[PDB]
Amino acid sequence: DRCLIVFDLDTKLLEQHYHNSSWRNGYADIQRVLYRHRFNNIQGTVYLSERGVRQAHGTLALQEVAIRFQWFDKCVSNVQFYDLSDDFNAQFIIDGVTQAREAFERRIGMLRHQLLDAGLTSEKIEEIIGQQKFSLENA
């Protein structure tokens, strides 16, 4: 109900999950949004919440998109927040946090000259950044 709709014959599992929720409407609400996304049955199903996309899961969905893609990990490192878009496949969602990373690689640069204006050297500007490995909350 939070991330996706399972539905299972186990009575205990229903009483527990489907005591204040819906597998049927939940599965309606699968379609209602895939319809909205102009989803072409490409693969998988998409499930939004009461809110839409969430900060948490949205970001959780990213760590999935890293299990699949290793190279994606730095982007997860470099992208903690990505405000998704309706009528856009996961495909596109992957290009945006790259776009985001690159952007965030632009913000690293500015603090790197703030270390050129500090006194550090060319190699040291590149040092302090990779040492902390710090990234913005809503990067």
UniProtKB/TrEMBL annotation:
Superkingdom per UniProt: Bacteria
Keywords in alphabetical order: Plasmid
The protein, known as: Virulence-associated protein D
Organism of derivation: Xylella fastidiosa (strain 9a5c)
Taxonomic classification: Bacteria, Pseudomonadati, Pseudomonadota, Gammaproteobacteria, Lysobacterales
